[PDB]
Design an enzyme around this catalytic site. Sequence first.
Site, PDB file in Angstrom:
ATOM      1  N   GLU A 119      -2.533   9.523  -1.019  1.00  0.00           N
ATOM      2  CA  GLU A 119      -2.658   8.113  -0.645  1.00  0.00           C
ATOM      3  C   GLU A 119      -3.378   7.368  -1.768  1.00  0.00           C
ATOM      4  OE1 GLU A 119      -4.022   7.687   3.423  1.00  0.00           O
ATOM      5  OE2 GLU A 119      -2.807   9.412   4.027  1.00  0.00           O
ATOM      6  N   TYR A 120      -2.631   6.857  -2.754  1.00  0.00           N
ATOM      7  CA  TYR A 120      -1.180   6.912  -2.952  1.00  0.00           C
ATOM      8  C   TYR A 120      -0.937   7.087  -4.431  1.00  0.00           C
ATOM      9  CZ  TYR A 120      -1.589   4.340   1.436  1.00  0.00           C
ATOM     10  OH  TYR A 120      -1.962   3.924   2.699  1.00  0.00           O
ATOM     11  N   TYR A 191       1.231   1.926  10.587  1.00  0.00           N
ATOM     12  CA  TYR A 191       0.057   1.624  11.393  1.00  0.00           C
ATOM     13  C   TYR A 191      -1.045   1.232  10.422  1.00  0.00           C
ATOM     14  CZ  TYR A 191      -0.370   6.701  10.545  1.00  0.00           C
ATOM     15  OH  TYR A 191      -0.409   7.942   9.964  1.00  0.00           O
TER      16      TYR A 191
END
Length: 376
Positions: A119-120, A191
């Site tokens: 990430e990321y 999300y």
Amino acid sequence: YNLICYFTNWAQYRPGLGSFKPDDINPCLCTHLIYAFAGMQNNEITTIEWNDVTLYKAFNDLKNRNSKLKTLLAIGGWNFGTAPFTTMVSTSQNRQTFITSVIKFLRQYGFDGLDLDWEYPGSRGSPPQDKHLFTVLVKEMREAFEQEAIESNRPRLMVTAAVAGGISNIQAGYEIPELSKYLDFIHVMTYDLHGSWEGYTGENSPLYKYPTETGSNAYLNVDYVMNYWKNNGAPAEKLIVGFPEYGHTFILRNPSDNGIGAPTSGDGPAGPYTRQAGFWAYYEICTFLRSGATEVWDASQEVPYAYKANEWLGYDNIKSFSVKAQWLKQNNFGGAMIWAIDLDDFTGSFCDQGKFPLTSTLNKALGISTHHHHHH
Ligand SMILES: [Mg+2]
């Protein structure tokens, strides 16, 4: 359809009824279970928690109760950051060291694959070349896994990845068409699309945009993100929609101003089990709702929100999971992933909706388990 369920190895430390370990998992709910997280040292995969090897065994023993279940081990996560991945992918030798360690680790402890949660690439300190080097890593790992399957006469290990849902991170991080050829599944983190990094209320995982959103704010919804991946080269059947089993909380600057986009002053109060301001598990949400909060359905975005005095909650419930599951089948996506099964009402004692209400909802809606005819 697939129902991919993340389990976290720190949930065990939550107090009392919040403590969750692998033997608390119903093995028939999901099609794939992912163990979050392993770490990295000297370009090799490693454990993190003192009892990981014991939990690995309990986790993969669940396959003895459900012969169709597959398990994966996830590496990385948000707090891990990017620097170890950048160094590992920077040379062919470091990648080979990592890949060799992964094959050994997964076979030793009984996992069916690796989930990459960097990430990321290209963000959070990672330099721009990591966008292409991530593709190279995944390609070399898929090839190594194919070769190991032939050499050991066993089915091939899977390779999956959890990927960004924010557009800027997607553009900086992924060569979508090439990456799509080598990954078995693409787990899109649809999300945390709103939260207290912004100065106003917003939904955690809205399906559609709010009517007033324009510009880049119009990208902060599940429909836009999933279609961005699809339209830029990822096959629908490999794309997995992310579903959160938690919500975000805010303090309202003015309690009379309590809709979507209302000004906030920071995170809401920590819950007694997850102990993080701004974040509540679904079982903690149920306590809030039953204590007298006002529940609102936002018809534009197809998600609920709730407020009580100056506390505001953006979350998901059985209805919003059901709407989104119907939507994903209509768009021919490959299934759903949940973050995380230890946040569901796994005991059934908080929400009065049965054990694992949110996860069971997706199991039913995607036809993983059906209503059986046992009359006689
Ligand atoms: Mg306003």
